[PDB]
Amino acid sequence: YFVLSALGLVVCVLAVAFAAHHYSLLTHLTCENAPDSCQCKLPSSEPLSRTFVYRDVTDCTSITGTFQVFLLVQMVLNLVCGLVCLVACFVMWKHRY
Amino acid sequence: TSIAITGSGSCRHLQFIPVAPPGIPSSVTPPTEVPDRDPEKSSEDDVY
Numbered sequence A: 001y002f003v004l005s006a007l008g009l010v011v012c013v014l015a016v017a018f019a020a021h022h023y024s025l026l027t028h029l030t031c032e033n034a035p036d037s038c039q040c041k042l043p044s045s046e047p048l049s050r051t052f053v054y055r056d057v058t059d060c061t062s063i064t065g066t067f068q069v070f071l072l073v074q075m076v077l078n079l080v081c082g083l084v085c086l087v088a089c090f091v092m093w094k095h096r097y
Numbered sequence B: 001t002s003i004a005i006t007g008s009g010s011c012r013h014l015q016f017i018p019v020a021p022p023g024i025p026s027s028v029t030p031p032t033e034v035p036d037r038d039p040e041k042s043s044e045d046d047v048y
Helices: A002-026 A066-094
Strands: A030-034 A037-041 A051-055
Touching: A002 A066
Parallel strands: none
Antiparallel strands: A030 A037, A037 A051
16 A cells, blocks of 8 residues: 555656646647648747647647646646645554654 | 641641541649658657
8 A cells, every 4th residue: 555655656746747848848839720630830040840730630729728728637636646645655654664 | 639738837736637536635634742841850859
């Protein structure tokens, strides 16, 4: 039980980090509507740039709307679950050591 | 016996002897244009 509480803590921490990084990425892309898709590219000093294609997306608002809301909810839930696992370990060693 | 008056030179698209030609040429198929674009890329190794 202690081992799995620690494992849940580390997995939730990894999820928090990945969600935060993905949100930080999505804060800095400019995206346009492509046929049944979205083309999100990043501004560059040189005229060339790297873009990404999100298929099966009618309008990019779904990426700029409910997607970032979903990321925020996911990171909030992940941090809450990580806190729960950490305090579970805390009580475990407060009754164990 | 026969006379065949045919165009040439600047009259390439013209035949003047009536042989009753029913020839109707087809249309050129439209080839898909293939522009090549090479923009820069950040490393996909950023993912790993």
